[PDB]
Design a protein around this ligand. Structure first.
Ligand SMILES: *[C@@H]1O[C@H](CO)[C@@H](O)[C@H](O)[C@H]1NC(C)=O
Ligand SMILES: *[C@@H]1O[C@H](CO)[C@@H](O)[C@H](O)[C@H]1NC(C)=O
Ligand SMILES: *[C@@H]1O[C@H](CO)[C@@H](O)[C@H](O)[C@H]1NC(C)=O
Ligand SMILES: *[C@@H]1O[C@H](CO)[C@@H](O)[C@H](O)[C@H]1NC(C)=O
Ligand SMILES: *[C@@H]1O[C@H](CO)[C@@H](O)[C@H](O)[C@H]1NC(C)=O
Ligand SMILES: *[C@@H]1O[C@H](CO)[C@@H](O)[C@H](O)[C@H]1NC(C)=O
Ligand SMILES: *[C@@H]1O[C@H](CO)[C@@H](O)[C@H](O)[C@H]1NC(C)=O
Ligand SMILES: *[C@@H]1O[C@H](CO)[C@@H](O)[C@H](O)[C@H]1NC(C)=O
Ligand SMILES: *[C@@H]1O[C@H](CO)[C@@H](O)[C@H](O)[C@H]1NC(C)=O
Lengths: 122, 109, 389, 389, 389, 122, 109, 122, 109
């Protein structure tokens, strides 16, 4: 039932920031981890990081210095900001609900993925 | 620590194909492995929701088995619609982050 | 495969126990297949600290004779079984805390022979109440089955022939304000409801439940011991009379392959630590850590305050990263609040280190860290000085 | 790979021991390749309870001086080494059980000084007999090698300088009714007979045997310690003089790969439990279960009656299903008969539970069952109060 | 993967300790990649027995009052905190060993009341010296941080309020003849020198070193604690002031995957044995063997002479075959010489068996051999009778 | 040396019983487990169960309610009875001596199998 | 718990063929595995009397190897007489009964 | 840098002895095991045994009775003697420095092998 | 105890080839495995100086992986110069001597 939709800028100049945000509809945000997955065009997937409904954060060590994730339960929306934008940043970004292996036995793995949104760097 | 997977696979129709992921003790030997299927130009979907279990709506010809340090996803029957990129994901205790292996691209022959 | 750590979400009031009340936790969780339909619903469950066993406070009376000789001097002491009325009067006078009770006991002054009769009451003792038969169970009672104390005899027998037991209240009165209301989602397979998801977000399996009634509201006693008020199949039977007894469960063990490596092994390691505790009659913070539940189900936490073993009921939640439990130096989050420390001692063997930093035995070991504070061993006094010899 | 459980087929008479006589069992069985020809034959073997070591009963004499002063009052006690003749007389009078012996020892009445000489004899003590040299071995004897007691000196030295040892019989007389006859099949490779199958149905390897003679009939001492009367190769040598000593076996360890996982590991786990017993000087039913032989070969069973450690010789048979050992509630079949229980205590840590049901520690663990009765620990008194300090 | 056994190459002087000074060894060795260029060079390192911690000898003064009554008779004893000057005088008179000091302490003769003041000094106690701040650390000092003893106050506080500590020397004087010269090869990656090979032939990683200075010569404190005098990068920082404190290392644990099976497991097994030692307050030769370092790095050996726990510094070398350590019966080669045995007791739990043969607990176990001598447990007295209660 | 021969009815009407019995010749029945193996035509083998010379029994859980096994050491014969006969029952039945893995080290596995006998249901 | 084996195998003459059985911890990880050979219309016979050992009268080209949770029977040389159905059997502690896997049919090519 | 050169007789009559010796140049002999490897023509390699700079010896059990190894640190030379020479002995012999797995972490395995020298039996 | 290796291997150019060594617990499960390469008429050289590590001067297409009781050496790319005899060696605790397996001869096709 629950589905996510990504929103945000499509092209960004170098040395700026990304304001991508996705919404959650049909279910509450509690008891679930929420993260962001990105994929360079034609290459494998990468895990940016996740956030919890409580607000604890975790980031990929390779991008720990450049990325921050914020959440707002009042409107069912979480976003991701990258401090520095380079040509390498161009990729397709996905939003996903992360259900931990042991948190809830009913749900396992990253269940729902939103429609991929492309971000380009000029 | 990283997950290693074959670059590509190819097989004649009506033949069993096996894809294998190899990991360390903290990746496969301690946590479950999930395999994803991605068609080109589309978001990936969870082919198996546990190392062995299958989520609803998945054809029964897909079945995965897990060795102590390695995983395997075998498709008993090959169909024209089985051509896709398959990616295996697992959690790493030491890293404390998800690990994605190099996706294998299966092409029917 | 098990999570790295588990932490209680809610902690009930602490209660004192001894080494003999310890028990290895249950690490099994039941999963059902086919339940794909969810629908919000409201349910009622017991509050924390009452789920395990309603406890009735009491006291034990043991009489002793303080005779002596009288210039000669020699003391004489022999025990006897007292009467309930004098036992109750003694308790009332000790409850008053007046010095008159203290002297009537502590100083014999038996001054030809002279004797002074005395009745000694022991610190309050607690006994589990069985709702189905209104019977009180405890180690002090011989055979562990005292029945109809309120119905027939105000006093119950004890292992020591000169000792009897008395509830603090004249009659077994139990408050019925033990219910809390929570939201949840109902998992239904076909038409039957296989299980429900609770407020904490953990799936609860309804398989193997039995019908019980507490405080006049009908409910179901789940496999793990949690009781929830909800609709029940008429086919489902009533709970067997026997309760609070040595493990006599059957279906789960046969139906669920007790994975040798996953369950049997962990059970053996736990039993090794428990056996060591019983043999040495002493505990250490490292050894206490081996009794923690490895899964999210309801369990019991342990700790030691003022050299006294303590326990409480709790609901366990899984942890993915050590950052969440210890966000900054000196804080262990529990329910979203920094838990307070009594003499720098937390639950389940967690202690505050000399550097003013939280030390977790299973976290330090994973970092190859070692500390002498955790290893240190301290003896624990037995709970029943007289009743049990 | 090991069987789930093993149970003795025949049990010898129980004998008392202490913690220091315990030893980890041998889990190795020798298998031979190429023996494809079988032929029925008859053989002779020792009865149960005599295979390990013929035991000679005895008693120890330790003298003490009961002097005192005499109005003054003060007691004085010093030990001395007595003479064999008075020791034997004292034993005869204690065997009579007359009160005169009791008083001559218990009450000094030394009433200026006055003294009363006394000779105290300890409860019977037993010592293994070595057939080859007719020597008596025991912990009480210094160095564990007392020789020619019957041949030269009726008394043997003890670790305590004031203590001496005396056999109950005047001379070392051994009954030769220790042989039983059984059927079997003979396994022959080529012409040589590699091994034989016994009455119990277990293959016995004849490799590495030595020629011994008991009661004047020549036989072979097998690798596992069993002695059988059969034809022997002239090439085979005589058994080495040393017997009943610290493990000094060689061929089996090198020739048979002591599988690390299968043998070395089990040995380490057994040694851990044995070490814990020695350190804590106490035993528990769970810990006793770790000393059971895991294979069908001949071994020793252990149990505790009247807080005294007990042992006996037995032949072990493998078990495939727990149903065979416990057909119905309250019966443990041994040799096809429900074994009797002394105070609800069986061999090898098996006990009768409070519910009147047989509990096996390795069966309950496999079902994730737990019970406090098995864990309970009880101290065992040392066998030699005076001889060994 | 670990070597079968390790043996010390050089042993320092033995020193006495108690159970509380024990610590699990470090089994991690750092390996670097890319260093393919070797060049002979000369370096300087500390001698064996000084690498761990320079130790300053001392003594503790605790005064007690020997008053009594005087025909009546009754003894009276109360403690007090003495003055440093009388403490030093008492020490000088006890160093003289004259009978006058012995009587002034042992016999009170307080003979209406009469009193006799007494000052008791405890057997010499040792305290580690920190070179960076010239501070003395020890368990006796409260909080483990006594500072500027020589600089300001000749005496330092102790946990017992009536006890004070005194160094044997009037001032903290340390001999600087602690350096030995050895040859080696220098491993260089590119231009930087990643590591050096020592005289023993073991590669030493220079990563994670800090600059320290002992005796006025600048050097580097390596990761494993060894100090070598060599060229240092200016970029490298100075060592953190804190030294000799609870393990606070960081980079190695995160950078090197502490293999769960290889390091974490061995650490848990070691901690189990260490915890058992602390709980039972007794040691056995088998349990001492579990504290041996499994790798060639510098460590500490343990042994028990005259029922006293002993320790020393050593450099460990790997062994490939048990033949090298024990060439013939009765010899354990150490540094190419048959090591001498004190009362048939070697280091690290190696003992001489009753058959006059060297027994190694990890060698006998691999052969499925067992012996009662190794299991035997013996209590160890606490080092600090008064200071620590 | 030892060999077994199966005997019994070849065809049986539905709702009746099977009286199959096999004999042992050349060796004693002691210290050995004796069981029965059946195979549907063209499919895999199935284990009905076994019995011991002592008389303890064990059965396949799928057929625990329908099958009983009896032994008579005096004549070296053991038999198998099925309470209910259906069309599914038709199969080829085999008699086998079961030597347990750990009972006797000399013998491992099901050593000797008798000639298969077909049973049909009308 | 059950034993899983390939449905069928095929190979050219003079070529090594490997047949594999996969089981749980209580099947292969705790007890020995025995492989049987059955010609059509005949009772099966015990090809190997232990996981590795061979009973007398068996050609030496048959050899089996056992992994911790899996078994394997490899025939070094393929002959016209090697065409048979092979069934692997093992004991199950939890079940307390013998388990027979799906027989693989080997056909020469 | 270090390299080894084998020296010795090429042909030997039966029932005699082999005096093969190899030299070490460019490095010291300390802290290393030194051994000898032989290979029959067209077959696999075999390990004769090794010796340590201290002088402890170890031999292949199949040849324990026939081979002895001696070392002389003063001249950087170690040799191998075989008591009995048969037609089977003919093989190509190699000298190798044996660096144990755990002795020195810098060196693993048999690093340097000398040029193979053939020995024939007439 | 001994080390078992394939008699021979053959493969088309530009194809991954895998060579496997199988040993007991005391051979591979306790000690590292070293693979050697020997051209005809020349002394063998150490292809890998540790189970996974490569000594300098070795093309990167050579890579070895070690299972608990077995080893494997896989060459990603096949070249005319890769035709050689490969021998795997490991230490045996119980034997106390080096063990050499049967060398596999790789021939390009
Ligand atoms: C034991 O307790 C049960 C439950 O309270 C009760 O029904 C039974 O009568 C008791 N047994 C006695 C009193 O002997
Ligand atoms: C229980 O019985 C009532 C009686 O009317 C019926 O309506 C209800 O459906 C039954 N429910 C179940 C679960 O049997
Ligand atoms: C523990 O001891 C302190 C000191 O007497 C006391 O104030 C505190 O209340 C005690 N806590 C408990 C739980 O008994
Ligand atoms: C030790 O016992 C053996 C066997 O009884 C005997 O031959 C030997 O003489 C004894 N040693 C002595 C008496 O010193
Ligand atoms: C033993 O010696 C006797 C002497 O005649 C001979 O007949 C017999 O065959 C010999 N047996 C063996 C096994 O050497
Ligand atoms: C055990 O104690 C009881 C009670 O005194 C006694 O009757 C019985 O004979 C004792 N059994 C043994 C074996 O000593
Ligand atoms: C603790 O020791 C350090 C190092 O000797 C010293 O710098 C510090 O001042 C000490 N702390 C005190 C004296 O409170
Ligand atoms: C340290 O500083 C001196 C200053 O002249 C310089 O010569 C030297 O190269 C420096 N070395 C390093 C390692 O920084
Ligand atoms: C051990 O005790 C003996 C006997 O008193 C003594 O001679 C020896 O010096 C002692 N050794 C040590 C290291 O104290």
């Amino acid at each position: 039932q629950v589905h996510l939709q990504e929103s945000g800028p499509g092209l960004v100049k170098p040395s700026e920031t990304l304001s991508l945000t996705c919404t959650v509809s049909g279910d509450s945000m509690n008891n679930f981890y929420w993260g962001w997955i990105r994929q360079p065009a034609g290459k494998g997937l990468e895990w940016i990081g996740y956030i919890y409904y409580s607000g604890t954060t975790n980031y990929n060590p390779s991008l720990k210095s450049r990325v921050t994730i914020s959440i707002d339960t009042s409107k069912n929306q979480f976003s991701l900001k990258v401090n520095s934008v380079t040509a390498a940043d161009t990729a397709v970004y996905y939003c996903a609900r992360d259900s931990g292996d042991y948190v809830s036995y009913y749900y396992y793995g990253m269940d729902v993925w939103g429609p991929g949104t492309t971000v380009t760097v000029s | 620590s990283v997950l290693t997977q074959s670059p590509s696979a190819s097989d004649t129709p009506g033949q069993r194909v096996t894809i294998s992921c190899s990991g360390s003790s903290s990746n496969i030997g301690s946590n479950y492995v999930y395999w994803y299927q991605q068609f080109p130009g589309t978001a990936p979907k969870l082919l198996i929701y546990k190392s062995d279990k299958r989520p609803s709506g998945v054809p029964d010809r897909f079945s995965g088995s897990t060795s102590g340090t390695s995983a395997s996803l075998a498709i008993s029957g090959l169909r024209s619609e089985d051509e896709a990129d398959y990616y295996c994901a697992a959690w790493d205790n030491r890293l404390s982050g998800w690990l994605f292996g190099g996706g294998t691209k299966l092409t029917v022959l | 495969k098990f999570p790295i750590y588990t932490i209680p979400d809610k902690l009930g009031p602490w209660s004192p126990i001894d080494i003999h009340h310890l028990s290895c936790p249950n690490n099994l969780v039941v999963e059902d297949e086919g339940c794909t339909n969810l629908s919000g619903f409201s349910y009622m469950e017991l509050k924390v600290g009452y789920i395990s066993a309603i406890k009735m406070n009491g006291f034990t009376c043991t009489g002793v004779v303080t005779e002596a000789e009288t210039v000669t001097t020699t003391f004489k002491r022999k025990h006897f079984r007292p009467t309930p009325d004098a036992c109750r009067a003694a308790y009332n006078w000790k409850m008053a805390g007046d010095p008159r009770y203290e002297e009537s006991l502590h100083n014999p002054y038996p001054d030809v022979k002279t004797t002074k009769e005395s009745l000694v009451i022991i610190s309050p003792s607690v006994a589990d109440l069985d709702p189905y038969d209104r019977s009180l169970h405890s180690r002090v009672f011989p055979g562990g089955n005292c029945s109809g104390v309120a119905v027939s005899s105000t006093y119950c027998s004890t292992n020591h022939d000169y000792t009897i037991w008395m509830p603090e209240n004249p009659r077994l009165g139990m408050s019925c304000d033990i219910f809390t209301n929570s939201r949840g989602k109902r998992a239904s397979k076909g038409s039957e409801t296989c299980g429900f998801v609770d407020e904490r977000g953990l799936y609860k399996s309804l398989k193997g439940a039995c019908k019980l009634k507490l405080c006049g509201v009908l409910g179901l006693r789940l496999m793990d011991g949690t009781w929830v008020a909800m609709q029940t199949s008429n086919e489902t039977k009533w709970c067997p009379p026997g309760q609070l007894v040595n493990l006599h469960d059957f279906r789960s063990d046969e139906i669920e392959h007790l994975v040798v490596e996953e369950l049997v092994k962990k059970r053996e390691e736990c039993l090794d630590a428990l056996e060591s505790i019983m043999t040495t009659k002493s505990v250490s913070f490292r050894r206490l850590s081996h009794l923690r539940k490895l899964v999210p189900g309801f369990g019991k936490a342990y700790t030691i305050f003022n050299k006294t073993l303590m326990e409480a009921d709790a609901h366990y939640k899984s942890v993915r990263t050590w950052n969440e439990i210890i966000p900054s130096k000196g804080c262990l989050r529990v329910g979203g609040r920094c838990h307070p420390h009594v003499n720098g001692v937390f639950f389940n063997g967690i202690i505050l280190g000399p550097d003013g930093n939280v030390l977790i035995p299973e976290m330090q070991s994973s970092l190859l860290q070692q500390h002498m504070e955790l290893l240190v061993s301290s003896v624990i006094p037995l709970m029943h000085p007289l009743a049990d010899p």
